[model samples]
Target: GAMHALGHCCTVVTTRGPSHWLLLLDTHLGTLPGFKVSAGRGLPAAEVYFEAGPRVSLSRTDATIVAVYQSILFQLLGPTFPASWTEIGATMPHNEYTFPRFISNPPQFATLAFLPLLSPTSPLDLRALMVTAQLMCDAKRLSDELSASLHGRMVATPEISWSLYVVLGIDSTQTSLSYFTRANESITYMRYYATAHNIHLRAADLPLVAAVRLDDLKDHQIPAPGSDDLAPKLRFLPPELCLLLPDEFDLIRVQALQFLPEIAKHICDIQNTICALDKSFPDCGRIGGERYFAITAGLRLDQGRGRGLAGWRTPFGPFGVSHTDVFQRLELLGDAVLGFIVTARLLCLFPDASVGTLVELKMELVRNEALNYLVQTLGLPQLAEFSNNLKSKTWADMYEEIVGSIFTGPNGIYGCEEFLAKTLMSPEHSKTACPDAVTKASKRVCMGEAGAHEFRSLVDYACEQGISVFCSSRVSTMFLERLRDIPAEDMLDWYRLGIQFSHRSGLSGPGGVVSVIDIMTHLARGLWLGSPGFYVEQPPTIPVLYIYHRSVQCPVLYGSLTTGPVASKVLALYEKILAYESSGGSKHIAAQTVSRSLAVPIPSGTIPFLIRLLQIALTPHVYQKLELLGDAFLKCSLALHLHALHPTLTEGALTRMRQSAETNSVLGRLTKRFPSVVSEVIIESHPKIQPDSKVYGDTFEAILAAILLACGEEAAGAFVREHVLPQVVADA
Candidate 1:
């Protein structure tokens, strides 16, 4: 209702033989109005004209000419009457028009023509159409130039190019170019204003940082390619001149952008008028780039007020303060767009990084503070009309809206990508590797009481330092290694090592602090007999701590001190359990020497293989591989024994007998005969091995595989016959 168009403009185009025709164009959405050829009589300025569909008219009097200039002069020069219109025009050439006081002191007018119309006396209607088409061609070229300039700034495909039809010029200039493009679904107008940079800078009254002269900049910094423009001269400002002028510079840029839309509107009107004249103008050939009208409209709403919507449920539905919805929706879209871009980049940059590390980097890049900083750098705040209670979130939200507008517009993802490439994804924000959460947290543990305050047990504290779970004596020896021949004191070094492991193993959370017991529990399932458990008790004298296998439902070991940090107590108990679980060579050999073992004695050279078989924590892959071989051997051995014992047994009977003999219950029961040989010899990294765990059965198979490989099948078969066959017969 209120002139719904990008913009409107009027210009006087001179024709042959002393005739000046006033051409009017207003860019509006949808169809143009249609008026049949009509004549008006009995007026001072009699005229013939067509309207709506494509308007053309002849006015005998110059009344319309005088009125058009008056409106232009009044709007630009304000309601002042310094000189009469006739007097101002008295001395000018028929083609020339000028106003010395209009905005610029220089007279902004162009009289020359590239293609002048023929001075034919008849058929003026056809000549008018020709004049409009020629003018349209000139405007089209100017739009092309604008597109080219933008193309230089961004890399885009040809289809994505030329879609952003732009018409840029000052309102006061008359070197008008009319351009028509077929894919002209949207229009953008741009105006460039000579900034009062010094005036605004002085008015802002901001402090200054150290300034660099043009000569000094060339030597020490990136110098501007010496320009006549006054904006670049500020580098020579005396004293420190950079404390806050970035915001000021942004203000200047926004001020320059204020005039761009008006230029777009004028060009739109020109194009629309030509299209109306040529109803069958080509449409299919043109490819569109961006829906600038929607983008421009969205930006307008992004900065508009929505008091009624926010303060009270006013009569207006979404339409009443509908801008708020658009703004919010844009922010919603922008948030996802930014996250996707940053996430993809971080993944690309840190392909081997853990999710915790990647998320940490992404949060750093796209957080409210970072987004606000980007918004400030772009000077977007100048475009917003918000209350003094503005927040960083507000800045971030606006940035998202800006992103959404470009992404949602016809430019699509490409425009958004270009915008982010120049802003968020610039070289300034690029990174090669992301910081590890646990690594950073490890440093904090050493610096202060975070070590003592957070950890309930030494195992928890040690994990923060990247240390793997080990027997207390082994860990103490590790401390000796790091400290170089010193008695192990406080458990600080262990905490550091555990944290380093946590980082390396990707066991830590994004914050670097994790329920390290969970990681221990995870490892326990594979390395220990069962899940391990820990808890501290307040004993009045000093805190007492216990570490044990959860399967036992009681502490396997406990530790205390008269004046102890409870974490040390837990560490003592952890070490004691490891000692309890480990088997000495003499104890295992002594057990083998007893009546339960077969005559096929284990060779001394095969000790390393047995040791590796028991050391499941250090080489789980090796143990599992050996276990597979042993499992096959045990099944075959049991089947052969079953077949020999029952010479005429059925296939089903033989299978059932072998299965019953080879079960974990039966194998684990057999493992009990030589307690030191299998149970204690298994060097569990996690202390709490489940008493009922099938790891013994698995270890049994692994041992058999090792024995068979080292001692030959005859000794292995004898060993199984003497040690295993009797037990199976006894159970049967």
Candidate 2:
């Protein structure tokens, strides 16, 4: 039977236990049958254990029982086996019939075995196993043929007797086992446990063995090629021999090998999870599961599970069939949809046009001015999505998302690629319904056609009425009779016509395109003041005259609505003033302040005109409002002012005074009034203002300048003549 002992001993020097041990057992009768045992210890006492079992069945007639027993013993010793050993026992039976005699004769065999061992186990146990196993297997043959083998092999041996020594118990020697130190300190070397046993002993170390001499060995002086004295050679051994090493060494190696495959599989699974997450969240970069979960949670909260549908919902979640149906219908019919019927008709009217021309036409039709006109005309924003927590964003913010969703490409398609992709990928719009699915589904119907036609009609009418339609005499009549009665669609047409006229007439110079856009925007929006045709017919004629007069004298009327490079910037300022009126913006303050500051009565009717004009100018339909205002003022009002005052004052003094007055009056008025009518529009349109500067100050001056220009210098001169001249005459 094989036996194993796993025990722990603690020393005062070390608090941790299981630092030392020894094992010995005796068979009273015949020599002990071949057996083997094993032992192991864990940090905790309860985890430590040992096993004992027969290496071979004694009943079986097996000649290899000794070999099996030796092998089993080596296996049982494990990787943690102690390095030093002392064994004392009777020699194997010398007689030839020793086995039979031991079995049948049953002589009283006194087997006194004294084996003194040390612990903790050595880290080199597995390494030593390879040498020991080879030596043991070849021991007999090598001894018998020593001379023959010695002729070619280098060997040197020292003798050490295995005689009986004085027995010592736990307290015997204070000397700690070398194995313990090696095991504790050689963790790095122990990592090579699987390959350690393959190493062969150097020829130099042969002197440590018994009864061997290098002189007697053959070829003792010859060295193998590529052999370095400094580098130790680790011989490759057969797998079977390698397997014969301590079980503990093999255990660690085998477990490590097994763990690698599973760890690799686990890593692959994590990679797959990451890939899935990436697909789910394309906008967000690669993120871990936990991080993704946090982000998704926030998104869920922000979207509110898609519940905030405003008026777009049906019975289902935030998105319903009815809403989709409407959208789909709008998509299918496109400009031909009921609300956009005019636009559709217009497109049909120009069926022979090229895509480029159609696109340009579409841009004119489906602009912010047109859309805003439609929104107001049809009250669409009333039906748009809103939230209880929604704050009133500026016009720039309000239309930002809407404009962002406009055209897809040069052909004037609608819907973004992402939205189209999603629709195409959905089961409903799969390959069957959407062949060339992505491209087909992404094609959006152009809505700008309706707006463009609407705008065109308005501008055509204005052009037909002559540029004086933008002047005082015809403005009021046009607004009251024709413009006020016109539908939003018609108004958009009219506005577009104005923009197209400007574009065709080259009113938009290098920098005037934006101005044209701004002016058109205001015109489009101007159609929304309740009775569109009436408003257009009765459009602020007095203000128009006033603006024109100021434009002739000062040549620039600074105001919030005055910015933009468009020829229609004056018209945009009128629209903006109208917008302020409709929204109930701070009208009295603006009116009273301008009146008091200029020492003139600010006409109440001018408010609506100013609002309408500002809507055109500051909505940024053409060029940016600020730049347009600056240019128009410089070219018109400022030039006029310089001309008017240059002859009356010293050149340098007049220049300084003009600058100071323009800065204070024109710039200041614009700075103040711009925010009231078109805060968002002005801010977004004017990139020149420092991001941190006060929003209302300089813009008020600009606003005042715009107002003056739109009014014209003739009207301003008349007002000054009637009121200011009288005061001056009295003072004189």
Candidate 3:
């Protein structure tokens, strides 16, 4: 077995299965281990065949390379382990922006960019957008590389037979399903595999994993490569070839990114910026790959702030990955961003595009195709190129939902400029960089070539003239119809008028006045309530809502009301609220603002002071301490006041009582009773306004908070205990 003294021909079949690669090596000067006996260390059927041998020859290097590549493809396509971002992100350039730093650094600027039908931007949302983009850029780089790698390898090794299998997280026992294994071993994370060669590792420790499959290849059968090959066995190599867009995907195409040439160049500039930043970092590559993933997906913290589908945050790091976790959360969020940025770009470049058209483009460009196209053009390999977040119908739904979220904005209605700004423009973004992309993105939507000025100017013209998309919109029309219905009025109090409209409109449960007033407060409170420059500094903004049943829709109505000519309409709503409330055979006074989501502890206004207070509060920072403390005081005070009156209540009883008290059941009820202390604050809107416990409870909580803020907690508590409660109890 050592060798035939002078020379001999012996071969070892090093690889097998569908992607059979035959390596013929000559034992001219050395032994061929386990030869002629079929090299059956373990495989499907390895054997020696004697023939007039017309075979391909290989040197040790060539043979090893081929064998290695073959096994790699198997392990890669098959399953090895749940991948960490280490090897996955190696070749990709670092996304210089902080993927997890949005909270750590609260920047001032906010915008209504990508969020749909939302409102004036919160400084927090802007940060979320920035950090989301930061996370997404790295995701973009890695996802791009993986999707491209799949495309690139196919081109490079045309002669090498290839087979790709997907290891979807499914439990179906269908015939097509297989337990993807690595080198015949189905070793998985922490699942007791070999620990040798220091190199002793589990499947995930293995590098060849995860080519993002979303946005690129949808599931479908494939035909043979050449029409001439009629051989049934020669029918397409596997069950399917990847990346054939399904009907849903066809609306968008990577083949034509639909980016005007200028936008394409802008994209190119950003691509260059990533590379340049990589060159400048100190030992950048050493920890960057892990850092990229760890910062986003593998972070140690799990702040109980979980959400639907977005709730996949788990720890995945070397220190350990036990019964716990690297979740799909950050990557999924990244997936969302990829969709969002692409959607924004599409909207910018193709304003005439319908929402459906934009949805299609967002899916195609953000998922597999566009990223892959970019990666392949750069000549990156398999691991870098192909990937996706969802497959088939599920992905389609998420795509539609996400696009819907974008157009819905926080306040409701598609007006996300920040998404476009961060994606297509930003001086702060090439912030550290020196690039024409960032430089040019300032006003124009960073299309690469010279047609930039024309595009942006045209967009601005449409903005001022008001695009038809704005006119034929739902919220706009509704507001107009309702506004026109309001009879001419006088002596109209802002709060009174809006609440009357809210009641008649049945827009929300009962406090629809607060719903409308909340926005107008953000607007006119600057004009009247807060200070001269108040509303100017704090613009009216809210979370996006898509449909009617959603509680936020009430707020969306307010969003539409103040969408344009904010100032005139700011007080105009007040006058309207006064007319509607005072004239609709109802009258009241009192102004307070808060959301019904009990989970939301403070108004959007509290964030500014809360942030600065917490940072320095533990009060060396007192000048602004009392600012939103009034908000904190109101919430706890309501809870406390309810507790104070009834000493012998159970824990749950106490909580619910406080909830009932704070929810303004008393405000609505008392207003129904006494009419008011001396004019001002909810009396008329309460009539005929029946609400479910939660909706009713939420209003109580909001009103109590408002009352405490409007009248100090002690004074408010006294009123509730001495005056308000007695009447409410007697009436009941």
Candidate 4:
């Protein structure tokens, strides 16, 4: 009974049946002025007292309450926690739902099992429906399905009401647990765990708790509605903690347990009881005033040696739901948050649309690739110390998970809304900024904005919003905030090309179409934020280009940072594809090319970005010192075109020989050599002939970018490389 006495917290679980009254200790209910605990018949029940505020009583049975000193965290645990002796979801993927493909045999976990619950067998116990809620959460289903954002409560129900939920499962869950995540967190839990009984509560030992009921129900029955005139309430700002206790000099007979590293840290004298278990045994006699070991007996340790916690890195174990078997369920609650936020917005955005349409829109940001880009943009992968920790799928998924939860608890996630909001631009901006960004991309996004979201020039945006900035210790510079207007067009030529490309690539849906404009918006924003360090050459900004490829179905944003011509050639290739629509656009030539994309742009008002996206694409690679990632787009396209021109070429020879194309001297020559390349018509100022300050290799990369943009990665790689690397093949 005194088990949790030493720790500052305790675990409490509520199964569906048997018990109606459970005490919510560690909680400070801000909603209640005061409260009394009543037993089975109303006698002042268990030894109740207030550390500061009252211990809220849980009158419902289905949900579990986590009392974290200041607040009552109620989660819809469903009726699926554990059977009489076992916690159901005991093991879960610690980092993420799936291990990387390299892991041979993976464990079976429900965190990702909605794919299998496509069908369900009947009788639908509380188990069936509750687990369904858990499934919806893991799948990141829509938010309306399971939401719990709430307020202070001297109320009648759980923060999440379970009544309406049992009804939803009657249909959605009976049919499938695979429907959505929104409903998972959105649904309530007033009566969620009501059928399971007192199976998991360990907090009964705390003086304030009481048992309103003393028995259990048969497997599938519901309990009589317990009186909730005393339902639980959540509190804010926990009890003030002042440390240190326990009078000295006493021999406490500790519970003897197994020998674990944890044992040595908590106990005393192992070696004096010590013999030569190992060659290093005699260092045991340095005893202490108080031998802390719990399991040592006469028996207490070495009888002379003592220990303390070693390798204790984190200040964690300060605590959340652990020491209990709800780990998997806790993860599910987290997953529920992600589902709820987006789902609610999706429904709001497309009230008349079918579920399939909603699902597709949800995928716009929540899918694997999008989240990957999001992390990349925040420079998470490059943060020297925390980057490795970010890779732990567990931590990574939780970030995405919290995104949808909107948890406003102590240290919550209310700011993400503004953060995500800052990333999007109006379609009018899209229409004006990078017309070639994608076909109809503007229309798709313009329709999704739920807010009357406004826009401003980068200079004004930074001042008003406090956007952060960083500069290299490598160069001396002054801050400049002026913005510029980019070039514009006379035709829907790019849009038409996006359409033609979508068809050419055999895409059933216009995935490429959606990403093109979206990517263009990213460039526009990055330019102002002055996205840092993905350059191989010097720049006030990184240069980048976007080409919607067939395999990707999303715009592949890339380009050389130093030279403008490669990016120019890239622009022309896509324009040629639009220009090629007359020639029956090949799945091969169907791609949107956007260049120098956002280096200059005036949103929606008119004029495409002066194609500075090459800079935007280059931001991911600048500081690594190796151009592997940044050069990939240029190299692959150049190699592809060259290979097509010379089928006898091997991927090996193409990789090595293609190095010549990345030379600054070579790029400076593209306009002189291939003057008609599409983007050459709009080179800022004049092409470099011979200058004292020349950006070399990437200049050549500019031409390759040019080739891929106009001829298509395959066409140009095939077309350009033949002459570029021809006779020199093998130093021939």
Candidate 5:
């Protein structure tokens, strides 16, 4: 294999007294004595020589080296041009400009061409001048013609060396060669500068360049100040030399600016390819060549394909990991970035959705199935190193790495955001990948389908069980129509009323009393999709109700209200129970009036934490992190409360009381008293898979934690004294 080459050639000049000498230095370590030639035909050029190998092997590095040349030209020539030229250059977006391809790298050299200025007395002959300038370049056609004619006479064989011009300067008019056109203003500026300075220029002393091999020319071999040792070093003037140049000259900044547009073309091409596959990929934004390679390295540079690279920063940013490890690091970063982006997007798109529905949508979007599909569809796997043996999961990992690279690379987070918005936020693909996002009302409708089914079952049972058809039909239809207005508290009271009535009445005649079993059974089913089971098992022997659903062997519902609320012995509890049902024609007003009879005072500004406490859905994982803190708070608070309440009690006795209050069964049953806690719980699971006491107990602990956090131990202890210790006393 032929070795790749990289070097720069510059035309440097030094002055002595009133003479200008062009300096030529050695190619290697820049240590050899340099040669100086006086102006006339004393110019020098450099040629890269190789033996018995490919003429050129241009790697991505070599391509950028040439790009650095163009960058130099832009910086040097830009200031002499009009401001409109800068405007014209600035208008070139990623799409509008196509970089000149560098596929055929021939034997190229760097040199200077001297085009002498015409005399003032010369005859005007623009056509002859134009033909002469164009002649050097059109030699290829002339040679082809000569070869064809020679071939007709006899075959031709040629091994020729001749210089052909790639760039020529001539004015627009069909007159004598003019050096004052817009294109040659930089040359004129150079002329004027020479005249103004000590170096006087004769009228015929004008000079420009034409070369056999078209390529870029470098300037001084000055290193960038404070540059990283490993970063690609371009040869430009250092600060010491820069002081002599124009005040506006900054090679690094200008070179970087020029280098980006050249590199962006390839990035744009990659983006278009993705768009062709997915129809919704947005227009690619600007990214420089260095950042592009760095990001690509983050995706493809792994241990299996370990290697060091030059010119660009191989790993992009300093990640403090091995070069090969960047892929994994970026993959991790990207996973987080992707999740955050999708979650924020879901919140914005479905502002009215329950946390349950939002979690479901987020999981669908970020899951490996969707990511893998996207990777394959975009053909990203092909770009990764070790593509042949890549794991399916690794494909998704690489996709995330790409995101992470973009997020951390020159494009930054907005670049990553825009890309994901184009990919994951595209309605066409997202709708296909994810279930239709639902509003809270729409989500409720889905829940109500089951609610309605159970409601209808109760209506049938009431008719067969001999309740009046008109009464049952009117109540049931009114209940269904006003379903939107009924809070969980009102619904709870209805079932409580029916259960109390059934307990009081002798297993007696129906029609008048409306079979309470059917009413309570169906209402419980509609509310939680579980059948109710009652037991008088705890000490104090108050009745506890449980709702048994199909998914769990254990009952989902548990009641720990003291006999004061649990038993019909308390008039306030029983009175309010009957008040809502008896005032049947005005249930809404009855519910409002009855609510004044019972409530707890949650800590101010702590409702968000309380709500988060009940949010058990899997989409958002915030509650789990809080749960550990809550668990600690619950243990400490309960210990302190019990220790204070029973100061004379032994340590063992205090521990026993604390344990009794803190048990999962006790706390789960206690949750039943907090109606809003039970109502606000969000679980993204089947309706039948009801949450048991463990879930309720955890939420109860979380609530206590929230209260303690927001209002300190004063409010939290007050809550425990009012609610927790009483359950123990009633049980005792």
Candidate 6:
């Protein structure tokens, strides 16, 4: 038999194994006595003791000890020992009352109590016994501590109230060991939790985990049924991991976190670039009219990378990269800062100009030509980045390609637009870039001192020359005539009066008339010089002379030659005769009569006839003079009628009538009748209708109209008074 103790103890028992004995002790119970115990085959039985001196013993008689041990082992462990030793037992007392004072003080007593278990047949394993004794002692101490703390607090009472007393004598020497073991176990469990969930247990994960935990707790309730009733735990996710989740999740927060740094970096890059640009062109914003002029005229600046491509070598050996590159860059920069620097410069340059004018000027300054010129002078192409192959091209070509490339690259428009916004809009960048551009621009376009002064001189010379040339013409002749007999002071009055009269007459007055004559002479000279007639010794000449002479007949009379009352009388007479003829009167007779009555006498007939002769004399002998003259006459006649009716009708209506007359008369006549009567009049009246000229015999019907108009003043007057006056008066 063996005794069982409630306190910490170690025991060993032996059955009938050839004279084997058992050893047992009551370490906590101090003096508990052993009781009779039963032994069975294959089972070890022993007495158990408590440090409080209480002992009890148990045995199995029927079954073997092995079988009994096996069957009751689980039950015994469940009731007497908790799965977690760290959990305080109900009967355990506090460390202050359960430490070395009671158990360690009586070590010899403990050894004596367990000495009986050290049998000769089966030598005792002291280490094992000691370990068991220690474990039991710790458990008892915990149980007693818990019991003492809950003495009045716990509702349920233990079946044996003195179990707490027995536990009070248990040693608490293992307190430090227990705490260390519990802490180690707890850390291990926490590590397992973290590993299973792939969570990092660090300060960084605190916010994330806390947020997840809060979510989980918000949906959970304590003291509920199995965890299935509680809300499912929320998962803690990394920022990148959240991207893998469905769009339903709060993905925006994740995305923002992930991309914020990148966005910030890009912004920083842009700002730095802008700042660099400003440093490069500090005076860009300080651009003024002079600055623009200087830049356009080929001034160079350090702001523009290098001397640009303009100074690059060329076929001619070092032809500075055409100034086009610098010009373009400046222009581009100007466009970017259109609001402040560019507009300001424009305002300064054209103080009195309207807003629209300023806008136009600004646009002009930024135009491709202007900019290209500025850039070229600045030698921008030399500094511009381009393929070596491209460098071989002319500066013009290279410059154009650079500009095109910049605007057309991948993300190019966007990049350029951003660049423009920053460079132009940013005061810092604009201040520098603007001045360089403007200076280069001014230089290239001759906007600088030399160029401006040259231009002014050119303009002044042109004006003086133009006035001298105009005064030498028939318009001035007429103006002088109108001013004749007037006092010098009254001359201005007469001139003003003449201008008014000319304006009312639908004549361009002296200046306009001179301009018209100049235009006509330019056309005639261009035609004659370029034509084969003037080049070849015996060139197959066209009847352009006849055409021109006839064309001028009406224009001269209605334009420069006529003035005052005479101009009015002539214009009225011409209109009346033209209206009559258009309404079906004989066209030739109407023209002849109108010409004669206008008082403009020609050598052979009237002013119209002389004009036709001039045309004949001027035309080449090779062309069908008669045909060309006829064409010319019809055109002249229509023009005369148009000018006559111009003062009376709207321009649109007058244009329509003029078109109808010319198209239906000359064009129709030429298309229908190969040899027109009008042509005969032009050809026969050529002054070159002499015996020696190459065009002598060529004169035919082409001169007829001229001969009629050249009938001299009296005869012409008589002719008009008889044939044209009455009809014209009737029409009026």
Candidate of highest TM-score: 5
Task: Point out where model 3 deviates above 4 Å.
Answer: 1-290, 294-327, 331-684, 691-732
lDDT of 5 by residue, 571-672 (tens): 232233333323222222222322232244544553432222223211123334234434544554455555445434433465566667777778766655
Give the poorly placed runs of model 6, Cα more than 4 Å off.
1-253, 278-383, 386-732
lDDT of each: 0.35, 0.28, 0.26, 0.26, 0.34, 0.28
Off by over 4 Å in 1: 1-23, 26-323, 389-393, 425-732
Greater-TM-score candidate between 1 and 3: 1
Backbone clash count, each prediction separately = 44, 142, 78, 96, 2, 124
Writing each residue's lDDT as its tens digit, candidate 4 over 1-732 gives 111111111111122211111122221122211111122221112111112222223323322212121011112221222221111222222221111111122122111000011112211122443454343334321221211111111111122231111100011111111211244353212112222221222221211111111111111222223222332221111001100011110001000000111112111112211221211211112222111011011111111111111111000111111111121222233333344334433332233334444455556545555555544444434321121321224323423432322222222322233233232221222222323322343444333321112122222332233232211100001111222122122112222332333343243244323443333333233232221222234422222232222223222222333323223443453344333223212211111232322122222311122233232222232322222222444443344344335444433455456666656455544423432232332232236523322333444344344333322334333434443544223414
| Reference-based TM-score, model 1 | 0.24
**Cα-based lDDT at residue 516, candidate 1:** 42
What does the lDDT come to for candidate 4?
A: 0.26
Candidate 2 per-residue lDDT, tens place, 176-250, comes to 111112444642212232335333322211111112111121111323332322222212111111112222222
RMSD of each: 31.6, 32.6, 27.2, 28.5, 25.7, 42.1
Per-residue error for 468 in candidate 1, Å, reads: 32
Which whole-number lDDT from 0 to 100 does residue 50 have in model 4?
14
Tens digits of lDDT, candidate 1, 618-699: 2333344345445655655565565446544444555566667788877776666664544554444326777677776776
TM-score each candidate.
0.24, 0.19, 0.22, 0.21, 0.26, 0.17
Worst 10 residues of 6 by lDDT: 309-318
